[PDB]
Design an enzyme around this catalytic site. Sequence first.
Site, short mmCIF file in Angstrom:
data_model
loop_
_atom_site.label_atom_id
_atom_site.label_comp_id
_atom_site.label_asym_id
_atom_site.label_seq_id
_atom_site.Cartn_x
_atom_site.Cartn_y
_atom_site.Cartn_z
N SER A 73 -6.40 -80.77 -16.11
CA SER A 73 -7.64 -80.08 -15.77
C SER A 73 -8.04 -80.32 -14.33
O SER A 73 -8.76 -79.49 -13.75
CB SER A 73 -8.74 -80.55 -16.72
OG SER A 73 -8.54 -81.91 -17.08
N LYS A 91 1.06 -88.10 -11.88
CA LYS A 91 -0.04 -87.18 -12.11
C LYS A 91 -0.91 -87.22 -10.87
O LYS A 91 -1.53 -88.25 -10.58
CB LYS A 91 -0.88 -87.53 -13.33
CG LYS A 91 -2.04 -86.55 -13.62
CD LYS A 91 -2.54 -86.70 -15.09
CE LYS A 91 -3.46 -87.95 -15.28
NZ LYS A 91 -4.07 -88.00 -16.70
N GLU A 175 6.27 -94.62 -15.90
CA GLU A 175 7.69 -94.41 -16.09
C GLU A 175 7.85 -93.13 -16.90
O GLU A 175 6.91 -92.68 -17.56
CB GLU A 175 8.37 -95.60 -16.76
CG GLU A 175 7.95 -95.82 -18.14
CD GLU A 175 8.47 -97.15 -18.65
OE1 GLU A 175 9.33 -97.83 -17.98
OE2 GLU A 175 7.98 -97.50 -19.74
N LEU A 176 9.00 -92.47 -16.73
CA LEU A 176 9.34 -91.23 -17.43
C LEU A 176 9.56 -91.48 -18.92
O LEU A 176 10.18 -92.46 -19.32
CB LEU A 176 10.62 -90.62 -16.82
CG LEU A 176 11.07 -89.21 -17.24
CD1 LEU A 176 10.20 -88.17 -16.55
CD2 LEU A 176 12.52 -88.95 -16.98
N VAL A 177 9.11 -90.55 -19.75
CA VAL A 177 9.44 -90.67 -21.17
C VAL A 177 10.42 -89.56 -21.55
O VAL A 177 10.48 -88.50 -20.92
CB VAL A 177 8.19 -90.63 -22.07
CG1 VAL A 177 7.15 -91.58 -21.60
CG2 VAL A 177 7.62 -89.27 -22.09
N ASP A 217 -11.05 -88.12 -27.57
CA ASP A 217 -10.85 -86.67 -27.47
C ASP A 217 -9.37 -86.34 -27.63
O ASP A 217 -8.71 -85.95 -26.67
CB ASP A 217 -11.35 -86.14 -26.12
CG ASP A 217 -11.65 -84.64 -26.18
OD1 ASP A 217 -11.40 -84.00 -27.26
OD2 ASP A 217 -12.16 -84.11 -25.15
N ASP A 236 -2.38 -90.10 -23.80
CA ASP A 236 -3.73 -89.55 -23.91
C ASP A 236 -4.77 -90.65 -23.71
O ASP A 236 -5.17 -91.33 -24.65
CB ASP A 236 -3.90 -88.90 -25.29
CG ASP A 236 -5.00 -87.78 -25.32
OD1 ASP A 236 -5.38 -87.21 -24.27
OD2 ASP A 236 -5.43 -87.43 -26.44
C1 MVS Z 1 -1.26 -86.41 -20.21
O1 MVS Z 1 -1.34 -87.38 -19.20
C2 MVS Z 1 -0.19 -87.58 -18.54
C3 MVS Z 1 1.00 -86.95 -18.85
C4 MVS Z 1 2.13 -87.24 -18.12
N1 MVS Z 1 3.40 -86.68 -18.46
C5 MVS Z 1 4.63 -87.35 -18.52
C6 MVS Z 1 4.74 -88.73 -18.48
C7 MVS Z 1 5.98 -89.33 -18.58
N2 MVS Z 1 7.12 -88.69 -18.73
C8 MVS Z 1 7.07 -87.31 -18.79
C9 MVS Z 1 8.25 -86.62 -18.98
C10 MVS Z 1 8.27 -85.23 -18.99
C11 MVS Z 1 9.51 -84.54 -19.06
N3 MVS Z 1 10.52 -84.01 -19.10
C12 MVS Z 1 7.06 -84.54 -18.82
C13 MVS Z 1 5.88 -85.20 -18.66
C14 MVS Z 1 5.84 -86.62 -18.66
C15 MVS Z 1 2.04 -88.14 -17.07
C16 MVS Z 1 0.84 -88.74 -16.80
O2 MVS Z 1 0.61 -89.69 -15.86
C17 MVS Z 1 1.61 -89.81 -14.89
C18 MVS Z 1 -0.28 -88.46 -17.51
O3 MVS Z 1 -1.48 -89.01 -17.17
C19 MVS Z 1 -1.66 -90.16 -17.98
NA NA Z 2 -7.75 -83.46 -15.52
#
Ligand code: MVS
Ligand code: NA
Length: 369
Positions: A73, A91, A175-177, A217, A236
């Site tokens: 947002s 982010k 870190e990446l998920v 939320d 979240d």
């Molecule tokens: C909702 O909030 C957030 C969401 C994310 N999204 C992600 C995080 C880690 N790996 C990801 C992998 C892929 C792929 N393909 C896509 C998105 C990822 C990151 C955030 O912080 C950096 C957020 O803020 C807390």
């Molecule tokens: Na936002």
Amino acid sequence: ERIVRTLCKVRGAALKLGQMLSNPHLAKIFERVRQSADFMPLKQMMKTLNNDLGPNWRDKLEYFEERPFAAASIGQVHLARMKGGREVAMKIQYPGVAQSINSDVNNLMAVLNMSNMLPPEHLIDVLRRELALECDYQREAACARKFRDLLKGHPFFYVPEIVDELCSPHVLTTELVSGFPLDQAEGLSQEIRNEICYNILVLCLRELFEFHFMQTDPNWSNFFYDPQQHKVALLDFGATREYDRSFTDLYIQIIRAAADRDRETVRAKSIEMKFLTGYEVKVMEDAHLDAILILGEAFASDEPFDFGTQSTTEKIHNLIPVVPPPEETYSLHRKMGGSFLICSKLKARFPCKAMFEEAYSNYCKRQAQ
Ligand SMILES: COc1cc(Nc2ccnc3cc(C#N)ccc23)cc(OC)c1OC
Ligand code: NA
Ligand code: NA
């Protein structure tokens, strides 16, 4: 017909609005804005990185993905990889988004009023206020750390580690998920969707009644399912709240009364918590107590609960019916209801008595102590 286009300019505020609203064409509008490939130009994102992490920010990375994975947002997520190989998600807020909120909200409402798309001013201030709380990425990082510590060793959930060196007031990096958000999991099998939503509702109950520290939320776009590990990453953290155990204890007495079909105790305890004044018009109060008792129905049954039809937004929107009111007047209902709505959107079915009796039992064990 294509308000979508002009709304994509304020897609951030429109998304937040749609998450509150949950005419039919307007949902299609919001769904299209959400599913839009329209993102903030890279150049604007670079200014936030430069301001927050210095002109040499890119030297910390081997790779920075210029197309965001998805937009929030008040910012968007860009995938990246640090020097050395560590994969991250970054982010990043739009530059000066804090000072753009009031204009973005006014623009969104103007587009919706002039288009005769919206048949409450106080709720517009709620929108402004919620967007402003989202700007606090330092707090969000601290909540991610605390949830990661609370969920240490869980067999199903995990919280990606925060990357401190890439975090700032306007940039949050984890870190990446490996997986995908739950808004893309509608096509998964019933057993998997049941297992995801079961674990999510149990965690809801633990956040409310065990941790006293909770995301108020819930948004299925911020849970990521890893099909290989069979695990869910929690991302979240935007509206995370800590409450005194005496406050959530009153809430567990409400849900207990609803599970026991004690409408009068639900009403009395709701007045005690200041969710109801006690002189509401009866028709509205009754619809509100009906929605609570739907929650009790689930927690009162050893038979599988059909969230997809029994707890849809239609049957549960009165959990929170239409100067804005204090947040503590509705945050717990928004949490419980939001969690039921995730189960409903993923069409889960599972019995809920066992998980509530475990939560209430822990409450009673402590009460005797
Ligand atoms: C909702 O909030 C957030 C969401 C994310 N999204 C992600 C995080 C880690 N790996 C990801 C992998 C892929 C792929 N393909 C896509 C998105 C990822 C990151 C955030 O912080 C950096 C957020 O803020 C807390
Ligand atoms: Na936002
Ligand atoms: Na931690």
